Amino acid sequence: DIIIATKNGKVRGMNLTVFGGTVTAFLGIPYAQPPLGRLRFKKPQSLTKWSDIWNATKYANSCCQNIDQSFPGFHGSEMWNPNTDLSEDCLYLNVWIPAPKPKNATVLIWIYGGGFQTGTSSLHVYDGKFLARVERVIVVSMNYRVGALGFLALPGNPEAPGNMGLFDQQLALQWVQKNIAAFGGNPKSVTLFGESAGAASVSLHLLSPGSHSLFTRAILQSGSFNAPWAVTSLYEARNRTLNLAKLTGCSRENETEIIKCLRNKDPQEILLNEAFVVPYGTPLSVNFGPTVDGDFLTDMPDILLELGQFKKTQILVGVNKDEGTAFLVYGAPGFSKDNNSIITRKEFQEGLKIFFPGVSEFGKESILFHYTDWVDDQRPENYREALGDVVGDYNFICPALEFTKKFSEWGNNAFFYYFEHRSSKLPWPEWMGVMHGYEIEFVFGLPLERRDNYTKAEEILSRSIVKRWANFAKYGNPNETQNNSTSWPVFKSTEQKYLTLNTESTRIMTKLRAQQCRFWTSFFPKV
Amino acid sequence: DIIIATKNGKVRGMNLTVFGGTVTAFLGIPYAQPPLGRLRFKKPQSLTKWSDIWNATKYANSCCQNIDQSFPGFHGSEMWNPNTDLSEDCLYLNVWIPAPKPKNATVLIWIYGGGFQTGTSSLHVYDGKFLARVERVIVVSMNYRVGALGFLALPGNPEAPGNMGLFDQQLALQWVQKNIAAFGGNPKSVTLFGESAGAASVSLHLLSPGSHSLFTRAILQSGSFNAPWAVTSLYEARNRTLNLAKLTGCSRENETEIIKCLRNKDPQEILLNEAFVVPYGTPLSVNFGPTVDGDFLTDMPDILLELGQFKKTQILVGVNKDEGTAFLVYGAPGFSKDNNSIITRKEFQEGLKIFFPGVSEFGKESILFHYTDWVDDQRPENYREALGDVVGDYNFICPALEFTKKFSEWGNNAFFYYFEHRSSKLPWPEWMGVMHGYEIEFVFGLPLERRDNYTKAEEILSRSIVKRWANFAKYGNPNETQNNSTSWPVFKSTEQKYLTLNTESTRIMTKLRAQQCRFWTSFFPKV
Numbered sequence A, B: 001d002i003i004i005a006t007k008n009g010k011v012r013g014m015n016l017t018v019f020g021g022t023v024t025a026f027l028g029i030p031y032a033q034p035p036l037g038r039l040r041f042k043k044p045q046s047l048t049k050w051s052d053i054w055n056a057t058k059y060a061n062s063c064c065q066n067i068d069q070s071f072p073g074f075h076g077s078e079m080w081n082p083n084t085d086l087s088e089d090c091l092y093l094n095v096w097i098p099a100p101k102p103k104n105a106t107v108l109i110w111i112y113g114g115g116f117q118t119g120t121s122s123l124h125v126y127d128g129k130f131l132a133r134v135e136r137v138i139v140v141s142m143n144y145r146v147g148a149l150g151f152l153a154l155p156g157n158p159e160a161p162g163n164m165g166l167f168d169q170q171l172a173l174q175w176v177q178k179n180i181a182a183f184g185g186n187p188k189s190v191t192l193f194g195e196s197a198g199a200a201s202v203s204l205h206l207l208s209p210g211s212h213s214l215f216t217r218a219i220l221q222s223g224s225f226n227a228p229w230a231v232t233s234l235y236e237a238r239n240r241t242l243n244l245a246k247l248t249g250c251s252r253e254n255e256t257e258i259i260k261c262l263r264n265k266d267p268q269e270i271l272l273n274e275a276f277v278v279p280y281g282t283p284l285s286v287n288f289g290p291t292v293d294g295d296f297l298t299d300m301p302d303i304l305l306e307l308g309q310f311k312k313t314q315i316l317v318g319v320n321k322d323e324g325t326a327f328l329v330y331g332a333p334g335f336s337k338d339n340n341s342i343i344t345r346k347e348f349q350e351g352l353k354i355f356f357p358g359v360s361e362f363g364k365e366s367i368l369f370h371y372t373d374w375v376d377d378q379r380p381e382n383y384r385e386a387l388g389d390v391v392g393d394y395n396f397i398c399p400a401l402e403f404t405k406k407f408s409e410w411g412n413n414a415f416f417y418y419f420e421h422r423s424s425k426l427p428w429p430e431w432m433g434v435m436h437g438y439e440i441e442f443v444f445g446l447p448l449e450r451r452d453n454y455t456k457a458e459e460i461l462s463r464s465i466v467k468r469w470a471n472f473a474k475y476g477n478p479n480e481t482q483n484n485s486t487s488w489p490v491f492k493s494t495e496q497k498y499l500t501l502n503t504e505s506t507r508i509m510t511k512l513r514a515q516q517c518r519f520w521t522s523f524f525p526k527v
C-alpha cells in the first residue's frame, strides 16, 4: 500500500509490473474544481482539501469532445478517440513514479494534442509507466478542457475570457510544483513535452509569464503556436462566439447574459453546434482555440516570439516525414484509406480549394507552381504526394522549423529531429507513410514490450529515442552517449542542423525543406 | 566528301545523322606503327607518313584480350566484350567532329577501363557522336594495348620496359596536340576523361611529366591510381613476368633473351597463361598493370600524390552507389545474377577470403567487425549488401575519395559526384543496384536518343550530366547554369562536399562513407 500526503489530501496509488519491475501509478488525481454550471467557461478554481484519502487507481473522465466517427471499426482513427467517459468534471491528472521511490527525479509533463477540440491523457499511446521504469523519471499527464468549453472567448469578460484549457494545463503545472516532491520528484527539473496541439500548448507556456517558473525545458513534437491552425485571432473569436450563441438560441446582447445562457445549455448541445460556427471549414479547422486574452497571452504570440519575449531555456523540436497525409482522407477528392489514392492534376487543384479556402486564386496558383516542378512526369504519385507535402509543410514542418530558428536566435540550445520511421503496426495504408502522431508510441517506449508485435529494431529505436528524451529532460542535451550513437548537434539559424531518426542510419542533415519553407514562411504571408 | 589533312597524311571521314543534325566521324585513324614482331612489348613507335588518303570509315581492330564468357547471350556481360577483330595491330583512334566544322572547340579524350586487361574504344557506350552533336565539343578515343602485351615489365630493359599501354595513350594525346587544330579543335582545351582503369590512367597522366603538356583538365570516373588494383609492384612485376615465361616454357637467363622468346609465341599463347601468372586471384585481379618504370612514372605514385608532384589543374571525380556488386557474381559463394543472392554469415566470411586472399585472419576479422553493425539483424540482405559495400568501398570509393582529397590539398578545384541512378534498361538483377560501369551511358548521352527506350527523366538526367561534363571541360567548372540546377560546390579537404546525381532531387552532401573510408584509408594499410 502506497499513500502519498499531498498538500490537500492523502492519495493512494496502484502498483504495476513493467519489464520485471514495479512502477507506482496514481491515476486520476483531481487538480481543479469541477468546472460545472456557474464555473463553466471560466478559469480553473483552486481546490478544497480532503482528509479522506483518495483512491487514484483508475483513469478519470475525459473532457467533453466530439468523437471521430469517420471510420467505424478502424483502429487507425479510433485509437485517438477517448477511452474513458466524457464529462465536464474532468480536470484530473496522472502520475507515474519509479519503484523504489526516487530521491530527486526529473519530471516529464505530457500535454496531449488533437486540435484543441479532442484528446485525453488516458490513451494507451501516452502510458507513462514505461518511461518511469526504463529511465527512472516521473511522468505526469493531465486532462484539460478542449473545444468551446476550454477555449470559448469573449475578450476581457472573466465569464468566458478564452484560454481556459491553457490555464487548466498551467494549474496542473503548479500542482506538480507544489506536490511532486512528495513523490520523490524534483520540481526544479521539469520538462514539458507534447504533440500537435499539445506541442503548440508547450510553446505558448514558453511565451506565458505565469508558466515561466513552472517548468524547466520544453519538447515540441509536430506542432508550434506559429502553425497556421494554433492561434485564433481576436476577431475570429468574436464572430465564432456570437455564431455559437445564435446556433444555441442564446443571442442576447448584454455580454455576461449571452454566457449565462450557454451555461444552462447542454454540453451535448454545445458540442454539436461547435462544428458549424465558421462558414468554410477544413480538416485542420480549429474553431475554439487559443486567443490573445491579455492574461495567459499578453500579446500576439508571433510578436513575442520575434522580439525575444519568452523563457530562455533549451527546446527539443521535430516533425515526421509525412505530417500531412492523415488529413487528406478526411475530405480530399480521390483520397481514401483503402485506395492507393492516385489523383489527377484537377483533383490536386481541388484539394487546394479545400485546405486553403480563404486564399486567393493567386495563392492557390503559387502553391501549384512551386510544388509541381518534379522531373519524372511518367509516375502516378506526383500529385498525390504533392498534396501531402503541401499540407504537411504548410501546417507543421515549416512553422516548426520557423519556431526553432527564432527561438535559437536568442542564444538557446535547440535540437531538431526528423522522424522518418514507419510503424510496422501502422493501421493506415502504406502510401500515407510516416504519419502525424505516429512517433508518440516511440517516445513513450511502447516497443520496449516484446510481447507487443513490434520489430526488435523498433525496440532499439524506441529505446534510443527514450534515452535521448530523458537525457534532454535531465541534462538539457538529447544525446545518446554510450552506444556509439550519432551526435545530435545544436540547431543554429545559420546552418540549421537536425538529426534524422530511423532504424537504418541516423544522419546529420541541414536546412530541412529549405526551398519549401522559404515559399511558406516568406512569400505566402504576403499572398 | 570530308577529307582532313593530318600531319601524317590525308584522312577521309564520314557524315552521321544525329538528332536532325550532322556529325562528321573519323573512325580508326592509325596513330603509331603496329606493335608487331620486334616491336612487341615496346613503347609505341612513331607513324610513317602516307602519300595516300586513309579511309577512316570504320572502327579499327581491338587489342588482343581474353573475353568474358560467363553469361553467354547475356547483354550485361557481353556489352563489355570487344566488337571488332582482335589484333596486335590495334593502335588506332577515333574522332568525332561537330558539323558545321567548329572554330576552336574543346576536345574530350576518352580512355576506356577494364582492369588494364580488356576494353576497346569501339564499344556502343563510348559512342562520341552524341557529345559532338549536343555540346559541339570534339570527342577523341583511342585503343591502347592491355594485359601483358601492354604492361609486361622488367625494370630497365627497353625491350620490355612496362607501361607500354600508357605510352600508347600518351602517343594518342600527342596526336591530338599535333593534329586536332586541323579538325577545329583547340589543343589548349583538352579534357581527359575515363572510367575504371581509364580513370586510373587519367590519374597517372596527372602524375607523369611527359603528359603534362598534352592535356588541360581531367575527369576520373570510378577509378584512380591509388586504388588497390591499379599499380603492379616491382616485386610482383618481377615474379609475374618470370612466371609467365615458365608457363609458356622459355625461362632464360639473359634478360633480353627471355623477351626474344615471348616475342615469338603467338598472341593466344600469351593470353592463355596471363591468368595463372599469379597464384591466387580475385575478380579484381590486374596481373599486368602500371608499374614504376622511371620513364612514365619516376617514383611510387602514392609518394608523388602525397608530396604535390603532379600537374596542377581542375579535376572532376566520382563513383557509383554500388561499385562492388558487379564483381560478386563472378566467384563469390552464394551470388548469382539469377537468384536474389541472400547469403549467410558463413558465406560472407568466405567472400572475404575470396576478395582478400593474402590478408591475415586479423584483417578479415576487422572487416567483418566493422561492416556488420547494422541495427535490424533480422534482414536477409545484410550480408549480401555488406560484401558489396566491402568490395565497393575498398576498391573504388575510398581510393577515389582519398585521391580527390590529396589532390585538392595543393590548391586546385575538385568536384566530387555520387551517381545513384539505376538505368531503366539495366540487364543485371535489381539487387546489384547502381553497378560499376553504368554511369558511362549517361555521360555519353545515350539516353538523349529518344528512340531508344530510356525513360523521359533519364533523358533529362543525361542532358544535365552532359552539360555539366562539357562545362567542366570548357570552363573548368561543372555547373549547370540555366535550368535552376543545384550548384556543384568545390571538394575541399575539411568540408568534403559532393553532389549526388539522380532523377529525383540532386543534393549536396558532405563526407561520403566517412566511417568506412577511415577504416580502409587509415587503419587497413597497417594490417
Ligand SMILES: *[C@@H]1O[C@H](CO[C@@H]2O[C@@H](C)[C@@H](O)[C@@H](O)[C@@H]2O)[C@@H](O[C@@H]2O[C@H](CO)[C@@H](O)[C@H](O)[C@H]2NC(C)=O)[C@H](O)[C@H]1NC(C)=O
Binding pocket: A333, A334, A335, A336, A338, A339, A340, A341, A342
Ligand atoms: C479510390 O477510392 C476513392 C474513395 O472510395 C472509397 O472506396 C471505393 C472502393 C468506393 O467504394 C467509394 O465509395 C469509397 O468512398 C474514390 O473516390 C471518388 O471519391 C469521392 C469521395 O466522396 C466520391 O464522391 C466519388 O464518387 C469517387 N469516384 C468514384 C469513381 O468512385 C477514388 O475515385 C478511387 N480511386 C482509384 C484510382 O481507385
Ligand SMILES: *[C@@H]1O[C@H](CO[C@H]2O[C@@H](C)[C@@H](O)[C@@H](O)[C@@H]2O)[C@@H](O[C@@H]2O[C@H](CO)[C@@H](O)[C@H](O)[C@H]2NC(C)=O)[C@H](O)[C@H]1NC(C)=O
Binding pocket: A236, A239, A243, A244, A246, A247, A276, A277, A278, A279
Ligand atoms: C461571421 O459570421 C457570419 C455568420 O454566418 C452564419 O453562418 C452559419 C454557418 C452559422 O455560423 C450561423 O450561426 C451564422 O449566422 C458569416 O456570414 C456568412 O458568410 C458566408 C460567406 O461570406 C455567407 O455565404 C453567408 O451568407 C453568411 N451566413 C449566413 C447564412 O448569414 C461570416 O462569414 C463570418 N465571418 C467570417 C468568416 O469571419
Ligand SMILES: *[C@@H]1O[C@H](CO[C@H]2O[C@@H](C)[C@@H](O)[C@@H](O)[C@@H]2O)[C@@H](O[C@@H]2O[C@H](CO)[C@@H](O)[C@H](O)[C@H]2NC(C)=O)[C@H](O)[C@H]1NC(C)=O
Binding pocket: B236, B239, B243, B244, B246, B247, B276, B277, B278, B279
Ligand atoms: C612467385 O612465383 C612463384 C611461382 O609459382 C608458380 O605458380 C603457378 C600458378 C605458375 O605461376 C607457375 O608458373 C609458377 O612457377 C609462386 O610460388 C607458388 O606459391 C604458392 C603459394 O605460396 C605455393 O603454394 C606454390 O607451391 C608455388 N607454386 C609452385 C607450384 O611452384 C610464388 O607464390 C609467387 N610469389 C608471390 C605470390 O608473390
Ligand SMILES: *[C@@H]1O[C@H](CO[C@H]2O[C@@H](C)[C@@H](O)[C@@H](O)[C@@H]2O)[C@@H](O[C@@H]2O[C@H](CO)[C@@H](O)[C@H](O)[C@H]2NC(C)=O)[C@H](O)[C@H]1NC(C)=O
Binding pocket: B333, B334, B335, B336, B338, B339, B340, B341, B342
Ligand atoms: C541462388 O543461386 C545460387 C547459385 O546456384 C546456381 O546453381 C544452380 C542451383 C542453378 O539452379 C542456379 O540457381 C545457379 O546458377 C545458389 O547458391 C549456391 O551456389 C553454389 C555455387 O558453388 C552451390 O554450391 C550451391 O549448391 C548453391 N545453393 C543451392 C541451393 O544448392 C543459391 O542457393 C541461390 N539462392 C537463393 C535461391 O536465394
Ligand SMILES: C[NH+](C)CCN(C[C@@H]1CCCN(C2Cc3ccccc3C2)C1)C(=O)c1ccc2cccc(O)c2n1
Binding pocket: A066, A067, A068, A069, A080, A113, A114, A115, A116, A117, A118, A119, A195, A196, A197, A229, A283, A284, A285, A286, A326, A327, A330, A436, A437
Ligand atoms: C494525435 N493526433 C493529433 C490525433 C488525430 N488528429 C488528426 C486526425 C486526422 C484528420 C483530423 N481528424 C480529426 C478526428 C476528429 C475527431 C473529432 C472531430 C473531428 C475530427 C477530425 C483526426 C486529431 O486529433 C486532430 C484533430 C483536429 C486537428 C486540427 C488541427 C491540427 C491537428 O493536429 C488536429 N488533430
Ligand SMILES: C[NH+](C)CCN(C[C@@H]1CCCN(C2Cc3ccccc3C2)C1)C(=O)c1ccc2cccc(O)c2n1
Binding pocket: A460, A461, A464, A483, A484, A485, A486, A502, A503, A504, A505, A506, B370, B371, B372, B373, B374, B375, B515, B516, B519
Ligand atoms: C550506432 N549504432 C550502434 C550502429 C547502427 N548505426 C550505424 C551504421 C549503420 C550500419 C553501417 N555503419 C557501419 C559504419 C562502419 C564503419 C566502418 C566500416 C563499415 C561501417 C558501416 C554503421 C546507425 O546509424 C544507427 C541507426 C539507428 C539506430 C537506432 C537506435 C540505436 C542505434 O545505435 C542506431 N544506430
Ligand SMILES: C[NH+](C)CCN(C[C@@H]1CCCN(C2Cc3ccccc3C2)C1)C(=O)c1ccc2cccc(O)c2n1
Binding pocket: B066, B067, B068, B069, B080, B113, B114, B115, B117, B118, B119, B196, B197, B229, B283, B284, B285, B286, B326, B327, B330, B436, B437
Ligand atoms: C566497364 N567495366 C570496367 C567493364 C567490365 N569490367 C568489370 C567486370 C566485373 C566482374 C568481372 N568482369 C569480367 C571478368 C572477366 C573474365 C574474362 C574476361 C574479362 C572479364 C571481366 C568484369 C572489367 O572490364 C573489369 C575487369 C577487371 C577489373 C579488375 C579490377 C578493376 C576493374 O574495374 C576491373 N574491371
Ligand SMILES: C[NH+](C)CCN(C[C@@H]1CCCN(C2Cc3ccccc3C2)C1)C(=O)c1ccc2cccc(O)c2n1
Binding pocket: A370, A371, A372, A373, A374, A375, A515, A516, A519, B460, B461, B462, B464, B483, B484, B485, B486, B502, B503, B504, B505, B506
Ligand atoms: C531544378 N530542376 C529543374 C527541378 C527538379 N529538381 C528540384 C526539386 C524536385 C522536387 C520538388 N522540389 C520543389 C522545390 C520547391 C520549392 C517550393 C515549393 C515546393 C518545392 C518542391 C524541386 C531536382 O532536384 C532535380 C533532380 C534531378 C535532375 C536531373 C536533371 C535535370 C534536373 O533539373 C534535375 N533536377
Ligand SMILES: *[C@@H]1O[C@H](CO)[C@@H](O[C@@H]2O[C@H](CO)[C@@H](O)[C@H](O)[C@H]2NC(C)=O)[C@H](O)[C@H]1NC(C)=O
Binding pocket: A103, A104, A186, A188, A189
Ligand atoms: C533536488 O535538487 C535540487 C536542485 O536541482 C536541490 O534543491 C535546491 O538545490 C539547489 C542547488 O542547485 C539550491 O540552490 C536550492 O537552494 C535548493 N532548493 C531550495 C528550495 O533551497 C536539492 O538538493 C534536491 N533535493 C533532494 C535531493 O531532495
Ligand SMILES: *[C@@H]1O[C@H](CO[C@H]2O[C@@H](C)[C@@H](O)[C@@H](O)[C@@H]2O)[C@@H](O)[C@H](O)[C@H]1NC(C)=O
Binding pocket: B001, B052, B053, B054, B055
Ligand atoms: C579509300 O576508298 C577509295 C574508294 O572508295 C571511296 O573513293 C573516294 C574517292 C570517295 O568516292 C569515297 O566516297 C569512296 O568511298 C579507294 O580507292 C582507296 O584505295 C581507299 N583508301 C585506302 C587507304 O584504302
Ligand SMILES: *[C@@H]1O[C@H](CO)[C@@H](O)[C@H](O)[C@H]1NC(C)=O
Binding pocket: A012, A053, A054, A055
Ligand atoms: C481505497 O481502496 C481500498 C482498496 O483496498 C479500500 O480499502 C478503501 O476503502 C478505498 N477508499 C475509498 C474507496 O474511498
Ligand SMILES: *[C@@H]1O[C@H](CO)[C@@H](O)[C@H](O)[C@H]1NC(C)=O
Binding pocket: A463, A464, A467, A480, A482, A483
Ligand atoms: C546499448 O546497446 C545494448 C545492446 O548491445 C542495449 O542492451 C542497451 O540498452 C543499449 N542502450 C541504450 C541507451 O540504447
Ligand SMILES: *[C@@H]1O[C@H](CO)[C@@H](O)[C@H](O)[C@H]1NC(C)=O
Binding pocket: B103, B104, B186, B188, B189
Ligand atoms: C584558340 O584558343 C587559344 C587559347 O585558348 C588561342 O591561343 C588560339 O589562338 C585560338 N585559336 C583559334 C581561335 O583559332
Ligand SMILES: *[C@@H]1O[C@H](CO)[C@@H](O)[C@H](O)[C@H]1NC(C)=O
Binding pocket: B463, B464, B467, B480, B482, B483
Ligand atoms: C533546359 O530546359 C529546356 C526546356 O525543357 C530543356 O529542353 C533543356 O534540355 C534544358 N537544358 C539542360 C542543360 O538541361
Ligand SMILES: [Cl-]
Binding pocket: A511, A512, A513, A514
Ligand atoms: Cl530537403
